[PDB]
Amino acid sequence: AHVQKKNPLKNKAVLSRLNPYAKAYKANVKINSEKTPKAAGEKFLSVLHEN
Amino acid sequence: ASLAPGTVCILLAGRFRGKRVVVLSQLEDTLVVTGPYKVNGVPIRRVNHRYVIATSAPKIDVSGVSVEKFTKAYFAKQKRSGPVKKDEAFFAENAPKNALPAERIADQKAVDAKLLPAIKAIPNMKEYLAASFALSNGDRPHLMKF
Amino acid sequence: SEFQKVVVIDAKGHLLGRLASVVAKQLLGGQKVVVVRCEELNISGHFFRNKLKYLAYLRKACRYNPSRGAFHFRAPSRIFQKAVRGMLPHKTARGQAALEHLQAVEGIPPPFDKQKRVVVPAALRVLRLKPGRKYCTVGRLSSEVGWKYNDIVAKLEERRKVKSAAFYQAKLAKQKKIASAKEASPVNQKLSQFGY
Amino acid sequence: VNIIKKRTKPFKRHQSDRFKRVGESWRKPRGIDSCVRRRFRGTISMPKIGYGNNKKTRYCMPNGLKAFLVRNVSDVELLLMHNKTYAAEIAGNVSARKRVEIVEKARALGVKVTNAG
Amino acid sequence: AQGHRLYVKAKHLSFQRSKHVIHPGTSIVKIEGCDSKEEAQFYLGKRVCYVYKSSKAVRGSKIRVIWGTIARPHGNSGAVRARFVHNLPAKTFGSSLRVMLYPSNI
Amino acid sequence: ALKEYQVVGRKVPTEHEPVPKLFRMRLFAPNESVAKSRYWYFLKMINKVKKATGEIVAINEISEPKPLKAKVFGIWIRYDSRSGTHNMYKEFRDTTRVGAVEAMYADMAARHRARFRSIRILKVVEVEKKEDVRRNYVKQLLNPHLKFPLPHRRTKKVFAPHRPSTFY
Amino acid sequence: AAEKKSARQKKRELIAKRAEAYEAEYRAAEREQIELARKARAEGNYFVPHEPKLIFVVRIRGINNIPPKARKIMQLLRLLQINNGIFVKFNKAIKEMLQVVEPYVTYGIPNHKTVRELIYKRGFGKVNKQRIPLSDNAIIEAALGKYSILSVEDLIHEIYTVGPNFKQAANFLWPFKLSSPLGGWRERKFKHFIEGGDAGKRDEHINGLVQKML
RNA sequence: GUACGUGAAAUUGCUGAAAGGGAAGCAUUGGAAAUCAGUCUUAUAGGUCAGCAUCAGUUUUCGGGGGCGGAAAAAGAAUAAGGGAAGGUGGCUGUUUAUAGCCCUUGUUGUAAUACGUCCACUGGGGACUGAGGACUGCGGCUUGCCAAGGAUGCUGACAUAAUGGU
RNA sequence: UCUAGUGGGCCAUUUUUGGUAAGCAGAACUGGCGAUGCGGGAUGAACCGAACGUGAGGUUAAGGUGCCGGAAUGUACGCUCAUCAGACACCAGAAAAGGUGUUAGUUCGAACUAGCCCUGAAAAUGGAUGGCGCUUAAGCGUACUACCCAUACCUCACCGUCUGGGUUAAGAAGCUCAGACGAGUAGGCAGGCGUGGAGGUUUGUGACGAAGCCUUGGGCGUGAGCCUGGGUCGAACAGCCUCUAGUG
RNA sequence: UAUGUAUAAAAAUAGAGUCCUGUAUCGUAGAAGAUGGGCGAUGGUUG
């Protein structure tokens, strides 16, 4: 048993065997739904650009 | 991807090295390829896809010729199953004159005549096919694009 | 990178070490190299410093039988060969056989004055030394340490230059006729969109 | 499983080349200042257990069989059950008559002979 | 006569070595016109052969050939590494090799 | 490879100092780890706070606001030498503070043989008025009609066929 | 006959659900830190991220010419070979133990990919004092099953989040025998990381190192 | 053949072969020359060396798409304002956008882009070495059979040779 | 529990004693050498890296990439001109003070302060940055990528040891699965190889050629060694189990 | 050791006789290069 070690990262079948969750993962999810409310206080900007 | 049917490719190895031929159809592993026999004298042969250079020359219309009759059994040699071979008479046998069934002759003639109209339509292709590819001084294959 | 059957190098204005290192690597690559006009080779540093270095070289000799001791060759071709020999594994049959692929000469003898002479940009004085840096020529250095054919080479080189100039005028006239007849051909524009 | 050899050249004794009183058969150097014992670069190498060959292909001839020394027909019949593993090899001191009997028995048994010729 | 030479000229430089240790198994090959590892990437996997001539005509031929394959680039100057079926002789340093255009991928 | 880092930190709260003061420094280092290391180095020498008894409260990378505008930066540094008694003020013309600082480090190493450990940068400021510049070479670059020949032309393929022109 | 497979299928589903919860926990924590940093920046205050509790220690020096105290400590860390990696809790006892072996090890904060890629590519378990690759979940069942660790992803969660059973999970994991880094180390390997060397604490740069050594 | 059974090594002469530029000998790797055996020859299966394909393990090298993070990059562009001086443009050495412009501040386009950092159980190629094990068991996937899932098979050709290998 | 060897030590870091000094004598902690190869320092017992079964592939340490020499006659900014420059730790040795040397800095034209170079500097066979040579370096300082390769690390195959799990269906002294590891002087122990003689055994070999001997032949073993073809020869000799010793 | 055994100005570099190298020019199509024919040129390669 286990004559050869097969890397799960490079073997999808072995990855499936070890992880019964890769079937439904959905890594890339659009989180910022195209809005992006920039948040940086004026006090922070002054301290950043101080001296 | 570049080995589409009807493409002009250069034979790298074999007795027809440097010849330019027209790809007919894609076999399971090789290419059933031939230059118009009346042009460069290259009959219908399988050529491994690792021994061709797919040139960017304009494509040749090969839709009008049947290619399903070119199979592994079609090009297969005869079974021997015996270590005894070779003879002066054996070399006298085979050859273009003997063997080479008239059925093979007719298919070569038919496909040749079907590929003349395209290469005559495109100028400078008949002489291009008849010529032989060769490297000269100062030619760097990794730079030049075929 | 390119391989020639024999490479004739015009050693005028070249640096001794920079050219010798390039030549030595080419010889080990199996290429026959001919170096002409070795009396025009340049060395960085003012002459007096180079003259003192060679006088230090003359000091080396066997305390018994100086005929066994180091042989100090004075000819500029032999100086260049010595620099190359120190860069080749000459005690070894590989580096020894690579020496007979090198032929350094003074001036350009008849078999090579009719052949194309390439130059090495990696060893050219103009491309390597900052302007205002003093430098010496191996030809003048040799003439002071014992070499006694400086003015003969100068006279023969002057005569060769005249003959080569006359050939160039003949070649210019022939090329001018070819160029004049070139534009008359209508193919010159049919080849235009191909970049030729 | 093809027959492979880890090493093919023999282990000769140090300086057996230079001295005739020193035979080539291997001897472990016990010297306090031995270069081969200390394993300097360029010196000759010594027998190690790492050099040992595969247990599956060990003792097997290149043809996959093991030579088996044979004195008479009784020794040939010992190889009746293993004609595909051992090949009979007739001894040096066997006479011509018993040799011919051994070869004829080996042929009938279908056992290869390493020195049939 | 310039209707041949479907290969690329190369020169056998040396063995894979350190200052004092050589590895005859793998050879360093300098291909003409190849000046960087990016250019050498094209020639990876090509069939490089050493052709030589000998007195006795095996197969009725005066020419023997040692075949090999280009394995990986070597350095930044475009030299590659090659594995030959029989390791190249040490006397072939500076000898010329022939790099065929196959196995092609272009 | 330098990056300007704003590092703010303080000593850990204690009974004697329930509300410790916050100290901030603008310092140049290849990465955040070195930036914090130098930040504790300067605080450890001035305000009696150790990395053991202090903490980094904020880390931030400052990018150049106008990197496409040619500027002049004057840098005061405390050079450390064989004698270790040296204060230097130098001016460099560049488009970014990080670029000017890197140019300063190379210049100090080349001229005075100073390492990254020997040099500590007291202050980097932007000189906006030409008359404030006191360095002749910088003022020469500030010449309105600046123009000069291209130096060091220098232009594998060994064995070129023709002698290089190396000119205009 | 089929009862074992019926129970095994729902066991596999439970593993999937737990792994799904773990991924949600990672995403929620990462987003939570980002929002807290944004709100502190917007309001002008400073929010300090939590000090790492998990550390990854890599031995960089060979086994020659080492003082007895450092030699014992790396023996207690199970870093007996050059290019060996271990996961370790970061507390007062550990921090001073790593301070002694600063010249001989490099340590930093591992991220989720570093832990996951290490346990998948180079994940080996100490089963019956043997180095058995983690090629199946049943291997972890037999070793850490009583600790409510049922799968490789459960083991990753225990290591990454430093659960109550970190010691048993870390001791079960045989020390990672990493390869030499592709691209090389810095010019002088045996300085401190601050000095442009490679020893000592290198913060998040252990991730860049681990990516090279895998 | 009494200088007598067998007749070793040191040492020596002759013959043949090859080497040798101030030592020789030795190890590794291959060439050359010499020499030799296995193997096959046979009973669908099998001898030697090759080429490609589809896989597996290890690694190397180029490329693409996407998510997230930072001053929710900094800049910049286009377009509206205010202010400013120059290393001073038009106008006459001197002045403040004219017959050039620049800088500073603010809005809009903008939720801009790019770079960098980071991740994808996202993806497209090129190269190399390796094939240990030997009916079936397992863990998985697919849909009972299939599968890249507990270690290479498939399709072909050349030579059957001194070819490979040995000395 | 019984016993071997040892009871001349040496080097390096840091601390230090006696000493005008020492490749000097004497100590303290740790690591090395002795006993230890390998990559680098041109070379070297203890310096730097790394510790070693047999191999394939990949990647690295210290050190390096002009040529010798595998690997950029790389990138960026500078300094240096030396009538016998400079060139990488240990290390193969040099000082105060100086300069119409030059590049910078600090302070009131001047004094300075700092780098590089030069002077101070002065030996005996011809001669050593390792050699050649090198001057917008192939020198020096700093940053930055790419690249080269150790017996080190990584994956794999095989050998052995040790360790653990199986085996009443398998010379059970057998078979089978798995993991870790491999330097070695003095010394220990185990298992084997070879020699002379003795008991047993093999329907054992042999004048149709035993033993012995020679051999540009062939095979087996990690090895000690064994087997065999050809030649020479002429009367004996061997395998296995055990016994023994004037046994290499 | 060949596979195109192809290439002859001298110079200066704060200049040369358009420059910013030759990735250019010369040669290159034909059983390893066959057997015939029509137009065009009066050139080209070679014994």
Tab-separated table of C-alpha atoms in Angstrom, chain C residues 11-184:
chain	number	residue	atom	x	y	z
C	11	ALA	CA	45.301	44.053	-34.539
C	12	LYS	CA	45.589	47.816	-35.034
C	13	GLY	CA	44.278	49.783	-32.077
C	14	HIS	CA	43.497	46.643	-30.076
C	15	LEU	CA	44.482	46.050	-26.465
C	16	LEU	CA	47.013	43.298	-25.847
C	17	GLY	CA	45.241	41.510	-23.004
C	18	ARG	CA	41.699	42.078	-24.253
C	19	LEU	CA	42.511	40.706	-27.702
C	20	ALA	CA	44.658	37.863	-26.348
C	21	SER	CA	41.827	36.716	-24.079
C	22	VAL	CA	39.341	36.785	-26.961
C	23	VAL	CA	41.787	34.994	-29.267
C	24	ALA	CA	42.688	32.398	-26.633
C	25	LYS	CA	39.039	31.475	-26.092
C	26	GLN	CA	38.469	31.214	-29.848
C	27	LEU	CA	41.495	28.946	-30.272
C	28	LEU	CA	40.216	26.640	-27.528
C	29	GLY	CA	36.927	26.581	-29.427
C	30	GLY	CA	38.722	24.877	-32.303
C	31	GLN	CA	38.933	27.881	-34.633
C	32	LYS	CA	42.022	28.889	-36.592
C	33	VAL	CA	42.877	32.548	-35.976
C	34	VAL	CA	45.357	34.787	-37.805
C	35	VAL	CA	46.323	38.116	-36.230
C	36	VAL	CA	47.939	40.683	-38.517
C	37	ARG	CA	49.553	44.065	-37.837
C	38	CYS	CA	50.818	43.136	-34.387
C	39	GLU	CA	53.129	46.170	-34.317
C	40	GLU	CA	50.050	48.410	-33.977
C	41	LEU	CA	48.750	46.714	-30.820
C	42	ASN	CA	48.115	49.078	-27.916
C	43	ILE	CA	48.677	48.619	-24.186
C	44	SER	CA	47.118	50.721	-21.444
C	45	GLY	CA	49.531	52.735	-19.340
C	46	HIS	CA	52.234	55.124	-20.454
C	47	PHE	CA	55.198	53.809	-22.327
C	48	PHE	CA	57.766	54.238	-19.600
C	49	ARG	CA	55.722	52.004	-17.286
C	50	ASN	CA	55.383	49.373	-20.013
C	51	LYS	CA	59.093	49.631	-20.830
C	52	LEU	CA	59.949	49.051	-17.165
C	53	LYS	CA	57.644	46.021	-17.085
C	54	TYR	CA	59.454	44.476	-20.045
C	55	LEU	CA	62.832	45.271	-18.489
C	56	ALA	CA	61.604	43.367	-15.435
C	57	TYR	CA	60.784	40.514	-17.824
C	58	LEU	CA	64.317	40.653	-19.252
C	59	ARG	CA	65.705	40.219	-15.740
C	60	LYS	CA	64.292	36.672	-15.471
C	61	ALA	CA	66.917	34.102	-16.459
C	62	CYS	CA	68.462	30.916	-15.146
C	63	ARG	CA	71.448	31.447	-12.873
C	64	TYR	CA	73.037	28.530	-14.760
C	65	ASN	CA	72.784	28.418	-18.552
C	66	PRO	CA	70.587	31.437	-19.392
C	67	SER	CA	70.053	29.421	-22.570
C	68	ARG	CA	67.712	27.343	-20.410
C	69	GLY	CA	66.221	30.456	-18.836
C	70	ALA	CA	63.181	32.304	-20.073
C	71	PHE	CA	63.370	33.290	-23.734
C	72	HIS	CA	62.383	36.945	-24.046
C	73	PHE	CA	61.038	37.467	-27.547
C	74	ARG	CA	61.087	41.072	-28.735
C	75	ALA	CA	58.941	40.949	-31.865
C	76	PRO	CA	55.416	42.373	-31.387
C	77	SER	CA	53.898	39.209	-32.840
C	78	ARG	CA	55.892	37.150	-30.344
C	79	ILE	CA	54.809	39.416	-27.477
C	80	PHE	CA	51.174	38.868	-28.450
C	81	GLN	CA	51.739	35.122	-28.745
C	82	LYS	CA	53.294	35.132	-25.273
C	83	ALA	CA	50.199	36.829	-23.861
C	84	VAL	CA	47.986	34.263	-25.599
C	85	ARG	CA	50.240	31.401	-24.475
C	86	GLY	CA	49.809	32.464	-20.854
C	87	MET	CA	46.042	32.271	-21.398
C	88	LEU	CA	46.093	28.767	-22.983
C	89	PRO	CA	46.930	25.544	-21.082
C	90	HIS	CA	50.072	25.133	-23.154
C	91	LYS	CA	51.708	22.433	-21.016
C	92	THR	CA	48.684	20.303	-21.953
C	93	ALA	CA	48.247	18.704	-25.370
C	94	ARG	CA	44.841	20.371	-25.746
C	95	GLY	CA	46.172	23.870	-25.131
C	96	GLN	CA	49.361	23.128	-27.038
C	97	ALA	CA	47.489	22.022	-30.158
C	98	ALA	CA	45.371	25.172	-29.866
C	99	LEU	CA	48.540	27.258	-30.235
C	100	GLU	CA	49.301	26.136	-33.795
C	101	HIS	CA	45.896	27.482	-34.786
C	102	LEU	CA	47.247	30.976	-34.020
C	103	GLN	CA	49.520	32.882	-36.404
C	104	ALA	CA	50.486	36.374	-35.249
C	105	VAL	CA	52.524	38.413	-37.732
C	106	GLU	CA	53.859	41.944	-38.117
C	107	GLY	CA	52.210	43.855	-40.902
C	108	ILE	CA	50.025	42.006	-43.381
C	109	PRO	CA	52.009	39.514	-45.494
C	110	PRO	CA	50.879	38.681	-49.050
C	111	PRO	CA	48.649	35.671	-48.223
C	112	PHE	CA	46.537	37.852	-45.901
C	113	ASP	CA	46.607	41.324	-47.467
C	114	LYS	CA	43.938	40.117	-49.930
C	115	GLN	CA	41.593	38.806	-47.216
C	116	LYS	CA	38.906	40.435	-45.099
C	117	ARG	CA	40.241	41.482	-41.689
C	118	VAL	CA	37.668	41.690	-38.906
C	119	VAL	CA	38.082	43.584	-35.634
C	120	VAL	CA	37.074	42.800	-32.054
C	121	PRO	CA	34.949	45.559	-30.442
C	122	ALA	CA	35.547	44.011	-27.013
C	123	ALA	CA	39.276	44.778	-27.344
C	124	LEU	CA	39.361	48.156	-29.118
C	125	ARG	CA	41.171	51.006	-27.398
C	126	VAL	CA	38.604	53.641	-28.382
C	127	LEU	CA	35.751	51.626	-26.860
C	128	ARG	CA	37.665	50.569	-23.730
C	129	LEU	CA	39.882	53.403	-22.424
C	130	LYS	CA	38.639	56.733	-21.135
C	131	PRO	CA	39.950	59.577	-23.329
C	132	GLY	CA	43.039	61.202	-21.881
C	133	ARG	CA	44.480	57.934	-20.550
C	134	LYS	CA	48.051	57.403	-21.697
C	135	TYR	CA	48.782	54.317	-23.781
C	136	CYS	CA	51.673	52.815	-25.716
C	137	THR	CA	52.026	50.800	-28.911
C	138	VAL	CA	53.701	47.395	-28.872
C	139	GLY	CA	55.588	48.331	-32.034
C	140	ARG	CA	57.381	51.234	-30.376
C	141	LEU	CA	57.934	49.202	-27.203
C	142	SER	CA	59.516	46.414	-29.252
C	143	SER	CA	61.790	48.802	-31.156
C	144	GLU	CA	63.380	49.901	-27.877
C	145	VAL	CA	63.802	46.489	-26.261
C	146	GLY	CA	65.622	44.909	-29.192
C	147	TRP	CA	63.310	44.534	-32.186
C	148	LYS	CA	65.206	45.723	-35.247
C	149	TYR	CA	62.756	45.580	-38.172
C	150	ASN	CA	60.479	48.500	-37.323
C	151	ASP	CA	61.202	50.703	-40.338
C	152	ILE	CA	61.197	47.819	-42.827
C	153	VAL	CA	57.645	46.935	-41.788
C	154	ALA	CA	56.676	50.611	-42.008
C	155	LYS	CA	58.007	50.875	-45.565
C	156	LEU	CA	56.390	47.615	-46.686
C	157	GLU	CA	53.114	48.602	-45.021
C	158	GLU	CA	53.149	51.956	-46.817
C	159	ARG	CA	53.602	50.198	-50.156
C	160	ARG	CA	50.832	47.726	-49.317
C	161	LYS	CA	48.502	50.571	-48.339
C	162	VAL	CA	49.049	52.231	-51.725
C	163	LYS	CA	48.282	48.996	-53.574
C	164	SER	CA	45.202	48.355	-51.432
C	165	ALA	CA	44.008	51.916	-52.043
C	166	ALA	CA	44.296	51.437	-55.810
C	167	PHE	CA	42.288	48.216	-55.547
C	168	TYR	CA	39.615	50.023	-53.530
C	169	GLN	CA	39.251	52.712	-56.200
C	170	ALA	CA	38.768	49.961	-58.784
C	171	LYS	CA	36.195	48.262	-56.550
C	172	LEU	CA	34.436	51.585	-55.957
C	173	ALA	CA	34.142	52.176	-59.707
C	174	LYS	CA	32.712	48.695	-60.278
C	175	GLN	CA	30.270	49.081	-57.386
C	176	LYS	CA	29.253	52.522	-58.667
C	177	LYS	CA	28.424	51.006	-62.059
C	178	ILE	CA	26.426	48.235	-60.372
C	179	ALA	CA	24.522	50.726	-58.213
C	180	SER	CA	23.763	52.926	-61.229
C	181	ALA	CA	22.358	49.945	-63.140
C	182	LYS	CA	20.557	48.757	-59.993
C	183	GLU	CA	17.882	51.465	-59.924
C	184	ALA	CA	17.010	51.020	-63.611
